[PDB]
Design an enzyme around this catalytic site. Sequence first.
Site, PDB file in Angstrom:
ATOM      1  N   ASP B  76     -38.370  40.630  44.232  1.00 20.19           N
ATOM      2  CA  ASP B  76     -37.783  41.708  45.067  1.00 20.19           C
ATOM      3  C   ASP B  76     -36.269  41.894  44.747  1.00 20.19           C
ATOM      4  OD1 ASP B  76     -39.803  42.242  46.916  1.00 20.19           O
ATOM      5  OD2 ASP B  76     -39.523  40.412  47.518  1.00 20.19           O
ATOM      6  N   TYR B 114     -37.111  35.277  52.268  1.00 22.84           N
ATOM      7  CA  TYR B 114     -37.373  33.892  51.700  1.00 22.84           C
ATOM      8  C   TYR B 114     -36.337  32.736  52.088  1.00 22.84           C
ATOM      9  CZ  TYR B 114     -41.171  36.688  49.548  1.00 22.84           C
ATOM     10  OH  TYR B 114     -42.157  37.617  49.383  1.00 22.84           O
ATOM     11  N   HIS B 204     -45.038  51.145  48.829  1.00 25.75           N
ATOM     12  CA  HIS B 204     -44.121  51.334  47.712  1.00 25.75           C
ATOM     13  C   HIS B 204     -45.143  51.597  46.489  1.00 25.75           C
ATOM     14  CE1 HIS B 204     -40.689  48.584  49.526  1.00 25.75           C
ATOM     15  NE2 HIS B 204     -41.043  49.784  50.200  1.00 25.75           N
TER      16      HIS B 204
HETATM   17 FE   LIG Z   1     -40.408  43.524  48.009  1.00 24.79          FE
HETATM   18 FE   LIG Z   2     -41.398  46.768  47.238  1.00 20.33          FE
END
Ligand SMILES: [Fe+2]
Ligand SMILES: [Fe+2]
Lengths: 296, 296
Positions: B76, B114, B204
């Site tokens: 990410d 996280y 996404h």
């Molecule tokens: Fe993500």
């Molecule tokens: Fe994403």
Amino acid sequence: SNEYDEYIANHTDPVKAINWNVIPDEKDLEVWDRLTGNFWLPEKIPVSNDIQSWNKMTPQEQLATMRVFTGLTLLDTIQGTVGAISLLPDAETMHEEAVYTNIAFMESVHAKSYSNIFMTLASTPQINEAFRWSEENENLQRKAKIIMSYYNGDDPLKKKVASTLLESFLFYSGFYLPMYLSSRAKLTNTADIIRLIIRDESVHGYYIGYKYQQGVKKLSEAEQEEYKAYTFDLMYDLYENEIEYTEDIYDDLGWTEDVKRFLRYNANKALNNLGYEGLFPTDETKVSPAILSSLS
Amino acid sequence: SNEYDEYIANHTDPVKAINWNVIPDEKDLEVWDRLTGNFWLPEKIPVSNDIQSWNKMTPQEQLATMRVFTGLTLLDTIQGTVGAISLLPDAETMHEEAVYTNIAFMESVHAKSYSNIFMTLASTPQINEAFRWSEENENLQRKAKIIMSYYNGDDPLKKKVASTLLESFLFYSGFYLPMYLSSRAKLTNTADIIRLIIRDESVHGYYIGYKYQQGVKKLSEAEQEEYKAYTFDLMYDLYENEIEYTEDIYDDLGWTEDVKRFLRYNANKALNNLGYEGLFPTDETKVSPAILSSLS
Ligand SMILES: [Fe+2]
Ligand SMILES: [Fe+2]
Ligand SMILES: [Fe+2]
Ligand SMILES: [Fe+2]
């Protein structure tokens, strides 16, 4: 299979994941919490309730409104898709990078809000004429391109100066209109959206200006003098350009002089955000307390 | 002769302001609405209620969770600060660029989620070791660097492939663990956070893949062939590397075989999002029902 090996070969250092358990600069965490905590979408504000107010407005007031708003949309579009993005690679910490992704998204939400307003209050021809006007207005196009020239340039400190001046100064010749109308009990829901946008730009200006000062403070005394000179020089060009933009939008309505004072009030704040003294004396920056409150 | 005079000369076309009243691709609006309506921050999930089940977890489980979460966090980070951002310049519509700014932001909310879990459950040493582990693990650095060689390249269609594969495939070796654990009453709140993330990533992947399909269909017969070939070659290299990575994370747990099926299952979904048929026969993608039901 082989195509990406040259890149691997030239990037031996490990790619790092962001760790929010260790924050090198506390400010980043502060702005992130503040910005995410202030999340909003224009759909949340009942703009439709400004319709009666919008219809009582004179054709002049509506035209001025369409234009300053389209001008604001242009600035947010730039800031969101070009500005914030241009600052990532020059970040000092990874958490700073995260913030810029939040600023880019919020800028897109700001830009969208104006369309929400238009689509709720204006006619399609009005909307069409406004965007056309923004494509052809020399002052608006000139301030857009000057700012983009720096973002597309290669100086990181200068990108932060332009960003800060765009955030704490260039929007204001436009923010004056809704704030004033709000003080006269007109377009109050529209003003609520505007206040939400200002709450965001205020923090963006302050934060990016902060990173600028941190960056520039690492240079020699002499180099810091040239960046200050460059900053004031840019402010002179932007101010000059903004004075004309303002005259053309507000002369009919006859609010020009009050907008200019507001322009000077905000120029001082934009310079302060960058760590510098104001440009205009206080008695030349008088703003109505009814505009300042509804601002806050 | 102003520092910007050249730029103004090298860009004669007007800078355009986004206009949401005129939409060339309705899918852009649908995705913007779905993504912004799905806004969330990790703070809204009471991860502290998972401390009991966390401590009830075996040393191998906690260790696996730490490393898998660190690998997800890394992905990410890349997606939020480099992936989505590299997509901006090649968008077909301005509304698409607006969507990408939301993706970059939400990828940062993902990376931070996280850290939220870690800080609520793990000890500083477990956290430092996990991040140390993710910087030294050759299979993780490998996929990170392959993906980044494309985001840093100059081929727009390759950026979308790389991005869709990361979105619909590379995360899953990691999403498997939280899904397995909540079906066994372990880390249930943490799993709610994972579901929110998956809800963003599946959109996404679908969206970026959709744009790839439109971009590629505008090419000649031979080029369309080559991009299809390139997608399958990359999909295979990524999978190859993912197997080694999966093995190193789950062998001690002995879940590897089921995780491998999950990998194949999502690999097919990733290729489908790019408009192609799966790479693996259906009978090779039979992930335990507990896992898929856990996704529900
Ligand atoms: Fe993500
Ligand atoms: Fe994403
Ligand atoms: Fe804005
Ligand atoms: Fe801003």
